[PDB]
Amino acid sequence: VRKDPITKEWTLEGGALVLADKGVCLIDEFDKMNDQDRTSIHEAMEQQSISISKAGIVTTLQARCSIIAAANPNGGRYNSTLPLAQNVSLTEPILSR
Amino acid sequence: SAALPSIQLPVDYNNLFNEITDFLVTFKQDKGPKYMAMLQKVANRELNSVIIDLDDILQYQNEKFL
Amino acid sequence: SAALPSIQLPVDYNNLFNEITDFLVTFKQDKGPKYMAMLQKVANRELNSVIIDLDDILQYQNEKFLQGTQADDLVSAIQQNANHFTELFCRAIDNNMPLPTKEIDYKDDVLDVILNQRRLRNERMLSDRTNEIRSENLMDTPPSSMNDALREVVEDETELFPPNLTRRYFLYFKPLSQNCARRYRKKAISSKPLSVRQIKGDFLGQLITVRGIITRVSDVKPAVEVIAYTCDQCGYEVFQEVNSRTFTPLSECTSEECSQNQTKGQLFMSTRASKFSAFQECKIQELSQQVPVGHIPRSLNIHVNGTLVRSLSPGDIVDVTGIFLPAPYTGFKALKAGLLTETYLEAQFVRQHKKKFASFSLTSDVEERVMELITSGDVYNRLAKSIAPEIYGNLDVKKALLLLLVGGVDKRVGDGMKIRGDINVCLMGDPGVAKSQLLKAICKISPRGVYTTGKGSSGVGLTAAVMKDPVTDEMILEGGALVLADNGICCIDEFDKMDESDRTAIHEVMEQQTISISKAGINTTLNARTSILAAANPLYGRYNPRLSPLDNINLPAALLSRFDILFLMLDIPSRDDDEKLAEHVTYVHMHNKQPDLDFTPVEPSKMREYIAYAKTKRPVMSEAVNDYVVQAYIRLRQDSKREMDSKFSFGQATPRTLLGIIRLSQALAKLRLADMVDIDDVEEALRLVRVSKESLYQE
Amino acid sequence: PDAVFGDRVRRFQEFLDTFTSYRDSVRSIQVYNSNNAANYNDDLNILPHRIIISLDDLREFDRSFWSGILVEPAYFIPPAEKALTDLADSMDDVPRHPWKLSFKGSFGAHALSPRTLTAQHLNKLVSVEGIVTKTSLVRPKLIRSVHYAAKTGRFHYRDYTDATTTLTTRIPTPAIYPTEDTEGNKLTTEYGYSTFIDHQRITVQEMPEMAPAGQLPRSIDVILDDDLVDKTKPGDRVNVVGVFKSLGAGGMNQSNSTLIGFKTLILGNTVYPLHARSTGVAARQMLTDFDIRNINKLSKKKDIFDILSQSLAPSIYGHDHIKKAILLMLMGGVEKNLENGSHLRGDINILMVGDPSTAKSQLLRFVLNTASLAIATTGRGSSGVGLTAAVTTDRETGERRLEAGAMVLADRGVVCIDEFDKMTDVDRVAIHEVMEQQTVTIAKAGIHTTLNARCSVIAAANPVFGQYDVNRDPHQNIALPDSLLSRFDLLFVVTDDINEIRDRSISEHVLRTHRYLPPGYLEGEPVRERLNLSLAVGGNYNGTEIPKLVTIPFLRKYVQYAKERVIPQLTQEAINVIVKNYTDLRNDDNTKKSPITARTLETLIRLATAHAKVRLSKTVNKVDAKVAANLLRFALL
Amino acid sequence: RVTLQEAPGTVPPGRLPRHREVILLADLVDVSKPGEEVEVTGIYKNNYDGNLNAKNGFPVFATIIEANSIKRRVFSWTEEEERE
Amino acid sequence: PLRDLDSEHVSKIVRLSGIIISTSVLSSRATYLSIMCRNCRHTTSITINNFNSITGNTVSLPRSCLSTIESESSMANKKNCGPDPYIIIHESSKFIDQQFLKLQEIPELVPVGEMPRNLTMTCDRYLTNKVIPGTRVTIVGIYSIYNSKSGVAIRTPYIKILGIQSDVETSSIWNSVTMFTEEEEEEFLQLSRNPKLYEILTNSIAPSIFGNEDIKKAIVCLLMGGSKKILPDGMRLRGDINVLLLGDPGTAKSQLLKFVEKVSPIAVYTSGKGSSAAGLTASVQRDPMTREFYLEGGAMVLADGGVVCIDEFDKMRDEDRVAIHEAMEQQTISIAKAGITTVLNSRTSVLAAANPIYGRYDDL
Numbered sequence A: 001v002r003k004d005p006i007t008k009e010w011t012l013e014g015g016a017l018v019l020a021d022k023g024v025c026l027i028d029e030f031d032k033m034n035d036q037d038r039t040s041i042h043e044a045m046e047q048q049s050i051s052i053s054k055a056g057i058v059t060t061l062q063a064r065c066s067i068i069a070a071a072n073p074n075g076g077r078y079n080s081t082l083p084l085a086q087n088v089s090l091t092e093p094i095l096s097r
Numbered sequence B: 001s002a003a004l005p006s007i008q009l010p011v012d013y014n015n016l017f018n019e020i021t022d023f024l025v026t027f028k029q030d031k032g033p034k035y036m037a038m039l040q041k042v043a044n045r046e047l048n049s050v051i052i053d054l055d056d057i058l059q060y061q062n063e064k065f066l
Numbered sequence C: 001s002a003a004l005p006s007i008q009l010p011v012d013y014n015n016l017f018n019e020i021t022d023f024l025v026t027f028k029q030d031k032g033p034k035y036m037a038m039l040q041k042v043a044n045r046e047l048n049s050v051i052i053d054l055d056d057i058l059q060y061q062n063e064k065f066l067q068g069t070q071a072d073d074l075v076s077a078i079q080q081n082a083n084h085f086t087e088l089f090c091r092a093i094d095n096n097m098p099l100p101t102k103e104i105d106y107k108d109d110v111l112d113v114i115l116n117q118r119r120l121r122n123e124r125m126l127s128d129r130t131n132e133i134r135s136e137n138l139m140d141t142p143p144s145s146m147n148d149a150l151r152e153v154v155e156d157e158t159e160l161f162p163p164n165l166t167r168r169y170f171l172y173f174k175p176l177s178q179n180c181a182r183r184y185r186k187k188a189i190s191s192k193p194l195s196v197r198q199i200k201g202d203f204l205g206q207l208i209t210v211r212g213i214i215t216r217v218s219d220v221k222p223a224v225e226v227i228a229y230t231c232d233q234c235g236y237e238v239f240q241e242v243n244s245r246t247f248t249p250l251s252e253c254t255s256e257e258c259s260q261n262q263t264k265g266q267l268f269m270s271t272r273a274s275k276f277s278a279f280q281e282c283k284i285q286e287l288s289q290q291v292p293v294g295h296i297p298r299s300l301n302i303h304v305n306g307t308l309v310r311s312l313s314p315g316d317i318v319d320v321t322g323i324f325l326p327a328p329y330t331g332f333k334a335l336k337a338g339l340l341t342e343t344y345l346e347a348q349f350v351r352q353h354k355k356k357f358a359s360f361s362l363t364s365d366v367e368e369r370v371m372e373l374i375t376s377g378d379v380y381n382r383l384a385k386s387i388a389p390e391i392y393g394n395l396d397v398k399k400a401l402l403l404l405l406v407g408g409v410d411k412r413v414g415d416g417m418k419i420r421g422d423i424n425v426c427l428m429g430d431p432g433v434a435k436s437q438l439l440k441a442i443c444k445i446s447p448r449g450v451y452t453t454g455k456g457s458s459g460v461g462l463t464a465a466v467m468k469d470p471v472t473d474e475m476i477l478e479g480g481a482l483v484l485a486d487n488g489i490c491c492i493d494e495f496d497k498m499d500e501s502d503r504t505a506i507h508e509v510m511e512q513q514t515i516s517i518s519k520a521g522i523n524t525t526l527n528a529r530t531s532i533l534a535a536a537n538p539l540y541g542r543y544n545p546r547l548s549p550l551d552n553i554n555l556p557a558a559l560l561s562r563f564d565i566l567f568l569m570l571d572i573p574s575r576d577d578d579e580k581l582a583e584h585v586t587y588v589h590m591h592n593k594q595p596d597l598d599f600t601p602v603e604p605s606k607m608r609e610y611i612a613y614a615k616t617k618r619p620v621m622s623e624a625v626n627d628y629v630v631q632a633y634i635r636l637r638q639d640s641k642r643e644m645d646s647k648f649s650f651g652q653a654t655p656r657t658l659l660g661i662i663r664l665s666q667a668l669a670k671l672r673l674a675d676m677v678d679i680d681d682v683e684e685a686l687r688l689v690r691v692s693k694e695s696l697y698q699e
Numbered sequence D: 001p002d003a004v005f006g007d008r009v010r011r012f013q014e015f016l017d018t019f020t021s022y023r024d025s026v027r028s029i030q031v032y033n034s035n036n037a038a039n040y041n042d043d044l045n046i047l048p049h050r051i052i053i054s055l056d057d058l059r060e061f062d063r064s065f066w067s068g069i070l071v072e073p074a075y076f077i078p079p080a081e082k083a084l085t086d087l088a089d090s091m092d093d094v095p096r097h098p099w100k101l102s103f104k105g106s107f108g109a110h111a112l113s114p115r116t117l118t119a120q121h122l123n124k125l126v127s128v129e130g131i132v133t134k135t136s137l138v139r140p141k142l143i144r145s146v147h148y149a150a151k152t153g154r155f156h157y158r159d160y161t162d163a164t165t166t167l168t169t170r171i172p173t174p175a176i177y178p179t180e181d182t183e184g185n186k187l188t189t190e191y192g193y194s195t196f197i198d199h200q201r202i203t204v205q206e207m208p209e210m211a212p213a214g215q216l217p218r219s220i221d222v223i224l225d226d227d228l229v230d231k232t233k234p235g236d237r238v239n240v241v242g243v244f245k246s247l248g249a250g251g252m253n254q255s256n257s258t259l260i261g262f263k264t265l266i267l268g269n270t271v272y273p274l275h276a277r278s279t280g281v282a283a284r285q286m287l288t289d290f291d292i293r294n295i296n297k298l299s300k301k302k303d304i305f306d307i308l309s310q311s312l313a314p315s316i317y318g319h320d321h322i323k324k325a326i327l328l329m330l331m332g333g334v335e336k337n338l339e340n341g342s343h344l345r346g347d348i349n350i351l352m353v354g355d356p357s358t359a360k361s362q363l364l365r366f367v368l369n370t371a372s373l374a375i376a377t378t379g380r381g382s383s384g385v386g387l388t389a390a391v392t393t394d395r396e397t398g399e400r401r402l403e404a405g406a407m408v409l410a411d412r413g414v415v416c417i418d419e420f421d422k423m424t425d426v427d428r429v430a431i432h433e434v435m436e437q438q439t440v441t442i443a444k445a446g447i448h449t450t451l452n453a454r455c456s457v458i459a460a461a462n463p464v465f466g467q468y469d470v471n472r473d474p475h476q477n478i479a480l481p482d483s484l485l486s487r488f489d490l491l492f493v494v495t496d497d498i499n500e501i502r503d504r505s506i507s508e509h510v511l512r513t514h515r516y517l518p519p520g521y522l523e524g525e526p527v528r529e530r531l532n533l534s535l536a537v538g539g540n541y542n543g544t545e546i547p548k549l550v551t552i553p554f555l556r557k558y559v560q561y562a563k564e565r566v567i568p569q570l571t572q573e574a575i576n577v578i579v580k581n582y583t584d585l586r587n588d589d590n591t592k593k594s595p596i597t598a599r600t601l602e603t604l605i606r607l608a609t610a611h612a613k614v615r616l617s618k619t620v621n622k623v624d625a626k627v628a629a630n631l632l633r634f635a636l637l
Numbered sequence E: 001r002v003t004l005q006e007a008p009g010t011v012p013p014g015r016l017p018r019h020r021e022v023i024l025l026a027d028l029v030d031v032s033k034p035g036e037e038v039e040v041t042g043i044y045k046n047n048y049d050g051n052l053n054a055k056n057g058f059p060v061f062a063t064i065i066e067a068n069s070i071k072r073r074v075f076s077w078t079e080e081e082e083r084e
Numbered sequence F: 001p002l003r004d005l006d007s008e009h010v011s012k013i014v015r016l017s018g019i020i021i022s023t024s025v026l027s028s029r030a031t032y033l034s035i036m037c038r039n040c041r042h043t044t045s046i047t048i049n050n051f052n053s054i055t056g057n058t059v060s061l062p063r064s065c066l067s068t069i070e071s072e073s074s075m076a077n078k079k080n081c082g083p084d085p086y087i088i089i090h091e092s093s094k095f096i097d098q099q100f101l102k103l104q105e106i107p108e109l110v111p112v113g114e115m116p117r118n119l120t121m122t123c124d125r126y127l128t129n130k131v132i133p134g135t136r137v138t139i140v141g142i143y144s145i146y147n148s149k150s151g152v153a154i155r156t157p158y159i160k161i162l163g164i165q166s167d168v169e170t171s172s173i174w175n176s177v178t179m180f181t182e183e184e185e186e187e188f189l190q191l192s193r194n195p196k197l198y199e200i201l202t203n204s205i206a207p208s209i210f211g212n213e214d215i216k217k218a219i220v221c222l223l224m225g226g227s228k229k230i231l232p233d234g235m236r237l238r239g240d241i242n243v244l245l246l247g248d249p250g251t252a253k254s255q256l257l258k259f260v261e262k263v264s265p266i267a268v269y270t271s272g273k274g275s276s277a278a279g280l281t282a283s284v285q286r287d288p289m290t291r292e293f294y295l296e297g298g299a300m301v302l303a304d305g306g307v308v309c310i311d312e313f314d315k316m317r318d319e320d321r322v323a324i325h326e327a328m329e330q331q332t333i334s335i336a337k338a339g340i341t342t343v344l345n346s347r348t349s350v351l352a353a354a355n356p357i358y359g360r361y362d363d364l
């Protein structure tokens, strides 16, 4: 929920996951997201919904979006002797979805 | 409001109206009451004026005092 | 009319003005009258401010009561109407002004020659009008009656400079003291100091005293009271009074010659002929002991005008006596209810709880007290034991804290470089040795003492920060704690818990006595001449003899070398000393005071004035003491070389140790009020250095 | 003169004649003022001219007049104030400001909240409970201005009125400031003869306990006058009784032309600071003579320390010495302020560390519930700014101003810190100053202040291995700095050791506690929760009126009485005992959980003083010193 | 009101792309989404502002384009598309 | 739809769906107001029944006194009262409340390169305080016009709210209902006499999840809860149960959490690190309009008297850890910030799920 500095009005942005409802979300460089985007992605693939409690707005938004992600291996090169779990920064709950 | 303030006066227009009605009904000067026959004559279009006598009212009050 | 009805008040200003005029010429304190001599000094351009003391007025009224005559209570009338009585006293003073004995010359102030020219112009106007009316000779006719009538017609016909435009003095009301009110059964609201919470709306218009700490002081600015305009058309000078925060200028001339004429002249401002005041706005804050439970301290505005400017500095515990006056409302228009007014205290008198060392003067009163303290005997030990009488023991610690308060002699060399004279002292030890209490005591004793916490004070709270001053409407650099403790002792408790920025700031301050800030706000160098007293703990919170003294002291070698004295304060459990410490602490808890009755501890004000007298001396060192110091330094360096490899190392001997020895010797010579440094001062300094670390660590 | 105004004046005069309590309350105020005036004349404080009026008694007397005040206060309150002023002037004939009214009792449908306030409650007397957020500066408002004409030497005056003083609206007549009189002479303002009445406005929003958890809260403005200013600080829980008034014209003038609407604010008649859990208002209660007599009867008993301690938390088995320590902390000791400005601690700090599920947080919550000014704090939830203080910017003045943290707001109170071991290092360094030097020093950009933070601290910690280990040294188990352990007066290690008989006793106590029913409640009915708000003035269940164990409301009376009344002093018989115990403890050889410094002697003195406060004794005796030493020896060993 | 910017493929190398304000009337609203290339025909007229521009010190006017027509330089299927 | 509102809908009743950003404070409008002339002392009453306009006074006080035009008195005592001579007698005036709402289109259906559009709405009387910000509503109202002082003759549109219908109703303490119909009471008592109530209530818990019958029994016990206590000494003992489910992935733990969230009267499903923009525990922030402390949100305070289903309980922040601890035993959250200190109720049953390290559970 963001305030425009000039318009001086509030806007509720659902983000890319809510905005791609009944569509597809294309996430480039899936490996290097921050913690907030990682939590948003986990909530989007877990319950297919995104909950917001900000600036007096408490609601949930539908995030029924198919996700196609692109990622690079750890170190920039894939290791065949090592499984995929230790080749990415993604943890098990976000990888199994 | 305080722009139209109120005062208490000894006159009460409810009990006075009740006394007026009782005087018009129950006054007998000495066919039936005087002002009840006057009102019957008015209602039959035989009279156009009703004259209220204050002597009759004073008589009524002094009988009520008796 | 009934639109502006009248009331009868007990006050009558005519007999009160007569009483004021009688008091100014009759009161003799026990050359002639006091205030007549003061006015003679003012008229000779030797004095700029007239201070009216209400104690003198109360004494005058009481003497008039002893002769039996009736005199009104002028003191209470001044206490309730100080704003009117300021102008009443100014008019009474202007009525009987002694003639200046000294002749005006080219070295006098511009204001003095301007007022003299105005006075001469007034006499010339009066003489010209009297001559003109006498030359008219209207009736051609009792010489005294005609002279009186001519005087009145000349006086009300001419346009003269008013007395406000011919005054060279500022008048202030000194509050009556509590003692003089106690002598004569008087109960004065002006004498009792109030907190800023207790000053309510019913105190407006009164002369009251507020007690508190000064937080912010504005820059001195010229606030105009009356603006002078000149007119080329008529030659008149038109004066417009100003009593608001903002004014509008005059455009067309309002003099009588232009008002009568069809063609109006145009006015031009003359800054030199107008009247200004030195103006400061100060914020006074409620003291910690005056704030109730769980409340935030409040602030009050103080307006400082005239010659009282620069008498208030931030961080000063002060009693400010002034007139509580209302101001126009400043704030949102929607939130105001009726005729809301802001408040300010027009300052009249300033009393310092801790007198500054630079303001010390060798008057007659301080001389007898200093001489008594000298002839009492053993001034050094007595002053050391009286710093914190509550804290048992720590004689050498209190001795070096007293040397910290006194400090050495700063050195300026002709090439421009300087050597600091301020001592820096560190107190590192186990918890429960009362080093925080000693730091608080040193802060209380020193006139400019700032107590800080290692994490409570951040980087911006120590050096500086740029902020906007709205009264002067300009960006100024508000200093931190090191600025606030300038030319004073800055006490940093929990020194080991500081972050690297604060460590860097202290690292520069202890040697350079300046802070060089080059940030996005300002590129400046500011003077911070603090004498720094730190308190600290070891690595683990406790001292262990297993490690070397350098190992368990988290202190880098450079900042270790900056400290002139470091005191290890070890809590070694011993049966004999614990008895004395326990009985001392328990006596302090029981009789609420020091147990030892064999000597009287020196009062903190007495200590402050003696240290102020000691700081005036600048001792020098002769050849013999120089050779003694040189040989001592050589032996110290050799001993540090020998003990560097051993576990008994306390660091490496440094030229800063030589400077510390010289500084401590000079401070000890200052404490003797001597201009020379002897051998025994150097022996005492070396003894303090040795018992700082080696005597207690060896045991 | 109005007829209904006079009739209502006579009716309130009859009401005041019926209830003599208001009459002799007026008489008590007048004799107090006259006594202070006589003392000022011969050799101070003045009471305001207002009377607390119970609405329930008025409803018992005249229901029509009570409903008139509640529904239309503008027509009914001024006659009542006039009648009170006439009665007060009638009793003042033998020995000037008009008397005011304050309302208490049940309001019914008019007991509202800032969210519940709508415009149907406008022009009505409403009671609104909430939390103070903004408190404006107390500003003097000019009522009468007095001026002097020097040419004639005469004192003139002018009176000024606005819409916020009177309940019923009148014609706004703006009288300008008189600077010249009728004949044109110069007038000089006589400050000190003019009349200024203090004025404040506060912003009361709904309390976060009953505010909805999701959306923004609602707030109202309250106008306060000379006797109601500085009764509140931001963060207080308040009940404001006043008339919900509307002022001005809502843009209906041609000059005004916007949709702020009619501005709405409460003309406050009464301000009650209520005590809530973990707030800045101290819980105070009226002490009757029966309660003082009972407290004095318990003071003479010899087992009183064992009665008050065991009656603290009877639902928690064991931990008897912890109960004794909590009681002695609630007593608070005596602080010393010397002639040189030095301050010596009086408050007692307690730290408890040990195994989980050992009734530590329950004891913390008990002390939060039973102390007058206890404030609860957790470890990682609060930070350095939230604990000591912070700096914000005022909107009106434009300058920086202070927010008092958890430790400053608990001045002369208890700080209940839970999960003490997870606090940050900056928090530890900040609280090193507060636990001993009892102050908070602020040195920020432009602000250098010192705030009083005189507090008692209870901390609950957890060993780094999760469970306390007997064979390990306690320094590794506690894993806290030595300075922090020296700050705390008592340190209690609690071990969840398993024993069959002891576990049987614990289980029986827990089940007997779980077989409890409140009075007046059915078997299947769930117990209802009512949020505890108390007005601030100025295993046996059947503990009622000191039978065996002291009930909690009477225990608070005992604690309050012992704090305000008795201030004990040391005597040499206790001094020899405490000196012997301290010098022995410094030279003992056995390993202790807490290290021994010079602070331990002061802990002994504080515990002896607190035990003397338990006994209601003007002096500290030898048995007090013995109890203080034997309580500390358990915590040490 | 629609902000029309020069397409970056047609801008000269060192120069910035110019922009204009296009006013769309009753039937032309919501026909051009942001980020798409359109070609607009319209009257290039002069907007009126009170007291001109005080910052410039010159009687400088702003210009707008009142759009007469918009041509753009959709997932709808027909029955033929269905049978395909 | 909100984007399809044209100029053909102006001063027409339209029905439009959306979400609500903010509900303003209740302004006070005047229905009946009594006025008095300043010097003429003429008393008049104005009754206003049109409150649906914004930014403009469609009804105002008269510009001149009405005593002269009425000619009410035979005496009729040049006299001019002046421009705007009437003052409002507030003690005899009647007022109502009015609210401004801001409604955005649904953020699910918005073009990617566009800021979503919103409309201002005015409601009054019994239509105020009927919705909270964030709920999805259908508004019936008049699409109308106001001029706010970018086009020589341009107007700002707004909606005169005539009725509000809520598509979904959020679950909370204040939105909960405690009244019950008599037939529902008869049905609930008749259900309780079934001796096989435990089996039906365990079977009804997640019928689509095979196995885990003891976990279903745990869920039933979680949903019922225990008896809360208020003891005479002041300390309270909680009745809510806390159930943790840790085990190998792909075992319907998250599905059980989702079913508990769907079946509970009040419940919040969240992760260990919270939600995308909804925090955990309790969040105290400043008010966006008044810069004052208030409770913004948090799963344990929005679900007081309910269940918080915390998936991924192992990954968690330290402040969240300590606040969750205080919420699990004491069922309260203690917040002591720089301005506000409070202890607020968090009476919530906690159902948490976690995954062990190194993937699968290790028996060694």
Ligand SMILES: Nc1ncnc2c1ncn2[C@@H]1O[C@H](COP(=O)(O)OP(=O)(O)OP(O)(O)=S)[C@@H](O)[C@H]1O
Residues within 6 Å of the ligand: C390, C391, C392, C393, C429, C430, C431, C432, C433, C434, C435, C436, C437, C438, C535, C536, C537, C581, C585, D345, D436, D437, D483, D598, D599, D602
């Ligand atoms: N020699 C002493 N004489 C009198 N009081 C003492 C002495 N040593 C310690 N105390 C007291 O012991 C207490 C210790 O308080 P502090 O002054 O904070 O000690 P400390 O050295 O600052 O401990 P820190 O802060 O961990 S370095 C105070 O109440 C002191 O008055």
Ligand SMILES: Nc1ncnc2c1ncn2[C@@H]1O[C@H](COP(=O)(O)OP(=O)(O)OP(O)(O)=S)[C@@H](O)[C@H]1O
Residues within 6 Å of the ligand: A093, A096, F208, F209, F210, F211, F248, F249, F250, F251, F252, F253, F254, F255, F256, F311, F312, F354, F355
């Ligand atoms: N016993 C089961 N009966 C029915 N569906 C099941 C069962 N076990 C797993 N599933 C399904 O398998 C999928 C795995 O999702 P969940 O098991 O719910 O995730 P989870 O592993 O429990 O939680 P994690 O550890 O954070 S991935 C879901 O679609 C479940 O419905």
Ligand SMILES: Nc1ncnc2c1ncn2[C@@H]1O[C@H](COP(=O)(O)OP(=O)(O)O)[C@@H](O)[C@H]1O
Residues within 6 Å of the ligand: D315, D316, D317, D318, D355, D356, D357, D358, D359, D360, D361, D362, D363, D510, F237, F329
């Ligand atoms: N000695 C005891 N007597 C009674 N109840 C106890 C005791 N010890 C623990 N409990 C119970 O254990 C529960 C756990 O809370 P608590 O023990 O306060 O946690 P912690 O010890 O971690 O603070 C409490 O509800 C309390 O009733």
Ligand SMILES: [Mg+2]
Residues within 6 Å of the ligand: C435, C436, C493, C494, C535
């Ligand atoms: Mg310390």
Ligand SMILES: [Mg+2]
Residues within 6 Å of the ligand: D357, D360, D361
């Ligand atoms: Mg616990």
Ligand SMILES: [Mg+2]
Residues within 6 Å of the ligand: A093, F253, F254, F311
């Ligand atoms: Mg899962």
Ligand SMILES: [Zn+2]
Residues within 6 Å of the ligand: C231, C232, C233, C234, C235, C236, C253, C254, C255, C257, C258, C264, C265, C266
């Ligand atoms: Zn001129």
Ligand SMILES: [Zn+2]
Residues within 6 Å of the ligand: F037, F038, F039, F040, F041, F042, F065, F066, F067, F081, F085
């Ligand atoms: Zn009129």
